[PDB]
Amino acid sequence: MSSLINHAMSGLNAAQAALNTVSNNINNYNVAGYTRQTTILAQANSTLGAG
Amino acid sequence: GWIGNGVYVSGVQREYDAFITNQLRGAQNQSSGLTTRYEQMSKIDNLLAD
Amino acid sequence: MSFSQAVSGLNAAATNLDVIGNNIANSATYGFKSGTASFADMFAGSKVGLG
Amino acid sequence: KQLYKQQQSVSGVNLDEEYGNLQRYQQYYLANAQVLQTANALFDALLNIR
Amino acid sequence: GKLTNGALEASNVDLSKELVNMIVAQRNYQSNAQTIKTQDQILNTLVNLR
Amino acid sequence: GKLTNGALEASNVDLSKELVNMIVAQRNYQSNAQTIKTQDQILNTLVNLR
């Protein structure tokens, strides 16, 4: 079922968000302050059925 | 009666809000005031900078 | 009747097709759960009954 | 600008999400095409039978 | 069950299983219809035969 | 309502509705044809019997 494209979408947007975060951080590297920002992700922890 | 009774559509909706939007509007207004004053001030400063 | 056996079966198969079509029609309805129908043998009197 | 982010998160759209949605609706439409085709073959088979 | 927020529950319909079930239903209907047809034509042959 | 300039507006003829309507109504065409044929069979039976 569409679960596969959903998997792909989850991965795509997760990588996309993390990439935006790292871009922000790498261009902000020398602001007057601004500790690094790190991204956190985890399993869907749910969303499963038969078996 | 014919039991499959096909799908129908529940309208179309947008993703936004009223109250938080209004708070947004107030914030933007204040910031516009500060921007106006800063640029007007920068004008005097550019001459005085010399 | 042999004929009735078939007719009944054909008719039932029409119902199965209807439920399958509805399954597809709901194939993205949020939270939806899939459906199917259940058959039984119209044995009565003796032999095979009617279908 | 942070509140602008707040609004955009609720109200904005981006390309990848619509890419995925476009593919998924491709899927649904073609599935419905297949079921209609099977219905047509079914009733035309009946016509043949009679 | 536990609550998830900012999420929604998909359809547990699998399109592949339904496609195969669709074609198998084609076969079931075709079996029924063609048994009907053979019996009917050969019966009409008998009903005529007297 | 209100008027637009340099624009035009097109019809409501969606192929998806009209072709499927053609399909179902052609099914009805052949349905009535089958009825007609069987009525012809009825008369031909009654004609040939005497």
Beta partners for residue C44, in sequence order: C46
SS (H, E, C) C1-51: CHHHHHHHHHHHHHHHHHHHHHHHHCCCCCCCCCCCCCCCCCCECECCCCC
Query: How far is F28 from E28, CA to CA, in rounded Å?
Result: 24
Resolution in A: 2.9
Q: How many CA atoms lie within 13 A of A16 on its CB side?
A: 10
The answer to whether the CB atoms of E13 and A1 lie below 8 A apart is yes
Beta partners for residue A13, in sequence order: none
User: What is the rounded CA–CA span in Å between residue B15 and residue A48?
Assistant: 28
d(CA B29, CA B35): 10
**Based on the number of CB atoms within 10 Å of its own CB, is F35 exposed (0-12), middle (13-18) or buried (19 or more)?**
exposed
Q: Which residue of A has its CA nearest to E17?
A: A1
Q: Check D39 against C27: CB less than 8 A apart.
A: no
Instruction: Give D23-42 as a DSSP string.
Output: HHHHHHHHHHHHHHHHHHHH
| CA of C22 vs chain B CAs: smallest distance (Å) | 5
**Residue of chain B whose Cα is closest to the Cα of C15:** B3
Query: DSSP letters of B1-50?
Result: --S--------------SHHHHHHHHHHHHHHHHHHHHHHHHHHHHHHH-
Chains C and F touch (3+ CB pairs under 8 A): no
D24 contacts in chain C (CB < 8 Å): 28
Identify the bridge partners of residue C46 per DSSP, sorted by sequence position.
Answer: C44
Both tokens assigned to C31: 């939270």
A6 and chain E: CB distance < 8 Å anywhere?
Answer: yes
- Give the method of determination: cryo-EM
For residue D6, which of B34, B23, A27 has the smallest C-alpha distance? B23
- In total, chain D counts a number of residues equal to 50
Q: How far is CA A12 from CA D5, D40, E11, in A?
A: 20, 39, 22
Report chain D residues whose CB lies below 8 A from the CB of F34: 47, 50
Residues F12, C47: Cα–Cα separation, whole Å = 58
Please tell me if residue D49 touches chain E, with a CB cutoff of 8 Å: yes
Q: Which helix (H) or strand (E) holds E21?
A: helix E15-49
The b-or-e profile of E37-47 (16+ CB within 10 A means b, else e) is: bebbeeeeeee
Running DSSP on this structure, what letter comes out for residue A33? S
- DSSP, collapsed to helix, strand or coil, labels residue F26 as helix
Is the distance from CB of E3 to CB of D15 less than 8 angstroms?
no
Q: Are F28 and D47 in contact (CB under 8 A)?
A: no
d(CA B18, CA F24): 48
Residues of D in contact with E6 (CB under 8 A): none
